[PDB]
């Protein structure tokens, strides 16, 4: 496990906080990081994001030991099962029909992290010289950037900029992206909703983290930076400190 902290804010000009997440521990005190951005464009986004977060918590706390070689399968299978349960829960309740959420999550190991991603929430690793986005946004504008139809700058001024193309709960099937990242030579792991990075550039995040301070110092400053950039969305992130290999 890492020293890690969860941070969330409703943001300016949002009525409700539909982001969810947490830091959870299994029976041998291994660590799972979870972040979910419930869909504001559909009904009941807070129900969906907290549904997925609660299921991951419950499933992980029931486990004794998930070692690194089991982690990709565990995350893929549980994300698929939770998507199935959420989808049919939404179909069975007319006031929830159409609800959904992103999910990025990470199982932490001594020298690596295993990440699953559905949607446009993100995971990054950061050190003094670079910031690497591990995940790939399942967003319509990312589709437009990759197909060369718009520039990454034009993405921020697109009418359909908030649209996402892979979501938990909207279909009975889902295919999460799985990533394995070695933590050696990195200083921080960051999971975040788009309320942060829609408004704060990667280099701004890296510059903040290279400074002195605790995880809570950095987290509060990063939240203030998102708000100073007038984020119009819920802003949520988990910051986790990677312990350098001691001599
Ligand atoms: Mg949302
Ligand atoms: Mg709503
Ligand atoms: Mg977005
Ligand atoms: Mg270092
Ligand atoms: Mg959002």
CATH number of residue 166's parent domain:
3.60.40.10
Is 194 labelled as part of a ligand binding site? yes
DSSP 44: T
Q: Which ligand minimizes its atom distance to the CA of 210? A: 4
Buried b (16+ CB within 10 A) or exposed e, 124-152: bbbbeeebeebbebbbbbbebbeeeebee
Determine if residue 233 is labeled as part of a ligand binding site.
Answer: yes
**CA atoms of 44 and 86, how far apart (whole Å):** 12
Q: What was the experiment behind these coordinates?
A: X-ray
Burial of 177 (0-12, 13-18, 19+ CB in 10 A): middle
CA 129 to ligand 1 centroid distance, Å: 31
Domain with 168 in it = 1-247
Residue 50 C-alpha to ligand 2 middle, in angstroms? 13
**What is the C-alpha separation between 99 and 43, in angstroms, rounded?**
5
Cα separation of 34 and 107, whole Å?
A: 9
Q: The tokens 């967003």 sit on which residue?
A: 139
Alpha-carbon distance of 205 to 212, in angstroms, equals 14
| Cα(247)–Cα(243) distance, integer angstroms | 12
**Residues 6 or more apart whose Cβ sits within 8 Å of residue 172:** 83, 84, 87, 88
- How many independent structural domains does the chain possess? 1
């Amino acid at each position: 496990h890492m020293e890690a902290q969860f941070f969330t804010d409703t943001g300016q000009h949002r009525d409700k906080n539909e982001d969810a997440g947490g830091i959870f521990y299994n029976q041998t005190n291994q660590q799972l990081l979870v972040l979910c951005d419930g869909m504001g464009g559909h009904k009941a986004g807070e129900v969906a994001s907290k549904f997925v977060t609660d299921e991951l918590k419950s499933r992980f706390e029931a486990e004794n030991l998930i070692e690194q070689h089991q982690a990709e399968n565990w995350l893929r299978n549980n994300i698929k099962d939770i998507n199935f349960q959420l989808y049919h829960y939404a179909q069975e309740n007319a006031e929830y029909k159409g609800m959904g959420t992103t999910c990025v999550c990470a199982l932490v190991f001594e020298k690596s992290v295993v990440i699953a991603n559905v949607g446009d929430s993100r995971a990054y690793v950061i050190n003094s010289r670079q910031i690497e986005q591990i995940t790939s946004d399942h967003s319509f504008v990312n589709h437009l950037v990759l197909t060369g139809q718009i520039t990454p700058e034009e993405a921020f001024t697109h009418p359909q900029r908030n649209i996402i193309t892979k979501v938990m709960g909207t279909d009975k099937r889902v295919s999460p992206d799985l990533f394995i990242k070695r933590l050696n030579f990195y200083d921080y792991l960051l999971l975040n909703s788009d309320g942060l990075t829609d408004y704060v550039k990667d280099n701004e995040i890296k510059r903040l983290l290279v400074k002195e301070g605790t995880i809570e110092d950095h987290g509060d400053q990063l939240m203030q930076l998102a708000l100073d950039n007038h984020s119009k969305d819920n802003v949520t992130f988990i910051l986790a400190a990677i312990e350098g290999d001691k001599v």
